[PDB]
Amino acid sequence: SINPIFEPFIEAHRYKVAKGGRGSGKSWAIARLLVEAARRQPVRILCARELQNSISDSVIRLLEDTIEREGYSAEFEIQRSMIRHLGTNAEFMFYGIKNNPTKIKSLEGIDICWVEEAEAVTKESWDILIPTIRKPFSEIWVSFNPKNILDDTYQRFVVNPPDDICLLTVNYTDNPHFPEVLRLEMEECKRRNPTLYRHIWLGEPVSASDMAIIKREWLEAATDAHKKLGWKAKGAVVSAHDPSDTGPDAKGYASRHGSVVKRIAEGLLMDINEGADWATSLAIEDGADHYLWDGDGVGAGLRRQTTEAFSGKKITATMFKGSESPFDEDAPYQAVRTIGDVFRNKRAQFYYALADRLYLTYRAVVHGEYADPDDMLSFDKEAIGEKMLEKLFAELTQIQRKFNNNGKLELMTKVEMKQKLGIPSPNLADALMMCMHCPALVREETEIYVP
Numbered sequence: 001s002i003n004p005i006f007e008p009f010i011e012a013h014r015y016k017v018a019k020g021g022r023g024s025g026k027s028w029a030i031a032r033l034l035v036e037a038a039r040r041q042p043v044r045i046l047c048a049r050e051l052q053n054s055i056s057d058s059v060i061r062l063l064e065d066t067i068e069r070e071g072y073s074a075e076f077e078i079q080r081s082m083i084r085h086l087g088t089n090a091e092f093m094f095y096g097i098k099n100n101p102t103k104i105k106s107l108e109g110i111d112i113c114w115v116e117e118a119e120a121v122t123k124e125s126w127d128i129l130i131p132t133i134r135k136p137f138s139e140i141w142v143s144f145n146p147k148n149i150l151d152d153t154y155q156r157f158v159v160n161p162p163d164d165i166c167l168l169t170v171n172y173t174d175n176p177h178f179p180e181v182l183r184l185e186m187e188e189c190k191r192r193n194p195t196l197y198r199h200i201w202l203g204e205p206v207s208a209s210d211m212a213i214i215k216r217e218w219l220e221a222a223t224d225a226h227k228k229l230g231w232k233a234k235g236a237v238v239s240a241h242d243p244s245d246t247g248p249d250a251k252g253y254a255s256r257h258g259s260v261v262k263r264i265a266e267g268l269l270m271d272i273n274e275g276a277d278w279a280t281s282l283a284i285e286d287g288a289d290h291y292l293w294d295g296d297g298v299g300a301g302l303r304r305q306t307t308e309a310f311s312g313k314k315i316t317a318t319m320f321k322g323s324e325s326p327f328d329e330d331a332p333y334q335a336v337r338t339i340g341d342v343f344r345n346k347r348a349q350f351y352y353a354l355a356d357r358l359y360l361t362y363r364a365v366v367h368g369e370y371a372d373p374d375d376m377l378s379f380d381k382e383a384i385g386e387k388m389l390e391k392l393f394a395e396l397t398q399i400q401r402k403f404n405n406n407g408k409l410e411l412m413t414k415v416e417m418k419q420k421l422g423i424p425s426p427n428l429a430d431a432l433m434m435c436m437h438c439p440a441l442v443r444e445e446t447e448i449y450v451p
Helices: 004-009 026-038 060-070 101-106 123-132 152-159 180-192 194-200 216-222 225-229 272-285 303-309 346-367 386-396 414-421 427-434
Strands: 015-019 044-049 076-079 082-085 091-096 112-115 139-144 165-169 237-242 251-257 260-267 290-294 316-320
Touching (some): 015 026, 060 091, 139 152, 251 427, 260 386, 272 303
Parallel strands (some): 112 139
Antiparallel strands (some): 082 091
16 A cells, blocks of 8 residues: 555646655655656656766665565666666656756656656756756656745745645654664754754744744845945944854854955854954954954953954954844933843844844845945855855844843843754854944044943
């Protein structure tokens, strides 16, 4: 008998999509149905995936194992990159979309395309693949484990689905032959990191909390926004350092030139002094006029080393304590209510400064609403590097408001984030937040003055 949950995939539908976490057996279910179809119809079946650096990355072994398991071996011809039924002449072929877009576009007579590990498939790859499956009554079958809700595959098939889709959600709980080997992994994870367990094993996509303060779409708009809207970085250079703690979590550094972010860096396997040396050296390299570091924890004693590093250079050095009452707390709140009435503390104050800059930039880029570039924020992608930029964005989107019994704005602490969300401390995000603050007044011709 075939897995009953997959019965709807036997009926005709243009799109057949199965999503869920690990151990659901969905790929085995799909392999079985395609083998049974191949035994009965002269179908050409394209097995596709985002990247196929070798044939061993494809589902070919899975199909062979399926054929052997059911006892169908004598019905088939097996080659390194082809399976063919000797009765119907049905054929399976295997290509990576990134690897052979030309070959894929040139394929004719395809009846079924199975895209496996489809969470890896990019918008560009879908746009290439889908128009090629153009035979009347041809079908696209898709199996994936959700990553982020905003990823193209999830958007394309779950959020804004096409006409004539059969969507199944299947997890290990729907697998009557869930392997003990996987049950062992699942329970281990469920206990150790409940949030991660829901993502990996219950197939829950990563999505922004309703309490999140910075949206991914704003960060995308803000990427190279100075190029998009055509302005240049003007202002002081501000750098900041998050020394993390005694644990493994990477240290953070961020630097900006006025409204344009120019560097985001991580500091691995450093003690507190190595970290401060690294960060102050980066600030010197970046031509910083102002440097801040988090002194609320392990960084509380770094003033001496920091000021010594800057000896002979006019660089201001400010210990940032996110737990303190907001800067200028008795001043009117702008954009009888004071700054202190609005924000619980400096961490909230400056995260909202960041969020505000980002939202304004988004409104400018996406909705064409004018804003002063000084009040915006752009990420210089070429300067920062795509890799570090993505790391930063993945942290920023998890920063969350928490309920406050005095109606003030307050955020979850990094310790709370680690404990509830099961993620490392967001030290890149915090480093960028700290460089929102410029408390030290200076001019080339004057003293540094801290009011």
